[PDB]
């Protein structure tokens, strides 16, 4: 609850300390990568991603200096329809690559 509150209140340095006490090394390494981000919307987007709030994370990434992080997040979650809809507006050159990876998943799904 303290860790989640530190993420909601954007206190990344305190969240690192709390997750290091919890022993969640994976979250600590990921927070150490984001610690230097000063863009409020980009940082809030990554922290929303870490709290599993992907719709708020997408809206914040679209309002940030790097909208492409929304596409990357949706690609990583395998939400291919949303990733393709984002790619149409933000990066048309990535559509074919996203479509190949989606097609491999669809070919496995039958």
């Amino acid at each position: 609850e303290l860790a989640r509150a530190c993420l909601h209140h954007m206190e990344v340095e305190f969240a690192i300390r709390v997750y290091r006490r919890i022993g969640n090394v994976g979250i600590v390494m990921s927070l150490e990568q984001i610690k230097g981000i000063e863009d409020y919307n980009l940082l809030a987007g990554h922290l929303a991603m870490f709290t599993n709030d992907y719709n708020l994370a997408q809206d914040l990434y679209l309002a940030s200096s790097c909208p492409i992080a929304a596409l990357e997040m949706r690609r990583d979650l395998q939400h291919w329809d949303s990733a393709l809809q984002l790619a149409k507006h933000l990066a048309p050159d990535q559509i074919p690559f996203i479509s190949k990876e989606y097609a491999i998943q669809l070919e496995f799904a039958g």
Binding site: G23, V25, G26, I27, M29, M49, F50, D76, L77, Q105
Partner: protein
């Protein structure tokens, strides 16, 4: 047919043992673990499959397998970052002293920052000194406790700390104490600058003549030119 997150987690753990990262990306996606999928994409810049699998093992909490994989790759740099992230600072320092000497100062600095955040200033001082960053991190950390900073400056007897403390005293208007510490620091330029600012140009000229310092002589020449 199985939508259960716990099964996709157990499969991601078995993907560490089988080293199959293609299936791990899918597992992380289906469990919603966006962070682990991102960490794997970033790890694709590393050429070593075992290092990429150690990143997956770190994201899943398999710390023993992650440690064994990093040791197997001989990448003591990622092992050091891992030990810092695990809070195992003593093992991080041991690895840095024996195998990753290039990061040893950075590890001492990060550990000193962690000790400072833990309110243990006395150990933080020693590791800021070992990292050679005390010249700015200590005056910062002790800026709220000026008596301890004065005692520390007088203990270390370092020209740059005496200059910093003299510049602090100068900002507070305590010029006689500033001159004393600038004399300890042998900073004949700052001595002449202060004596010129006080209007004691003859004492500035005596210092410039006796020390032979080119910068102090140049500054005094500019003052005489302005006069």
């Amino acid at each position: 047919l199985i939508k259960s997150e716990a099964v996709w987690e157990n499969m991601a753990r078995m993907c560490v043992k089988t080293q199959r990262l293609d299936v791990a990306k899918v597992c992380l996606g289906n469990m919603g673990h966006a962070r682990g999928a991102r960490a794997l994409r970033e790890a694709e810049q590393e050429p070593e499959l075992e290092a990429r699998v150690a990143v997956l093992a770190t994201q899943l909490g398999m710390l023993e397998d992650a440690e064994q994989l990093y040791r197997k790759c001989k990448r003591h740099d990622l092992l050091n970052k891992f030990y810092q992230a695990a809070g195992r600072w003593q093992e991080a320092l041991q690895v840095a002293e024996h195998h990753d000497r290039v990061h040893l100062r950075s590890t001492y600095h990060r550990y000193a920052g962690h000790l400072e955040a833990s309110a243990d200033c006395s150990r933080a001082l020693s590791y800021y000194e070992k990292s050679d960053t005390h010249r700015f991190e200590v005056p910062r950390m002790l800026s709220e406790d000026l008596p301890s900073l004065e005692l520390y400056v007088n203990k270390m007897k370092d020209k740059t700390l005496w200059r910093w403390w003299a510049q602090y005293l100068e900002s507070q208007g305590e010029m006689d104490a500033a001159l004393h510490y600038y004399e300890l620091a042998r900073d004949h330029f700052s001595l002449v600058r202060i004596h010129c600012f006080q209007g004691n140009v003859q004492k500035a000229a005596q210092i410039a003549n006796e020390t032979g310092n080119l910068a102090a002589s140049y500054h005094l020449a500019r003052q005489y030119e302005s006069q």
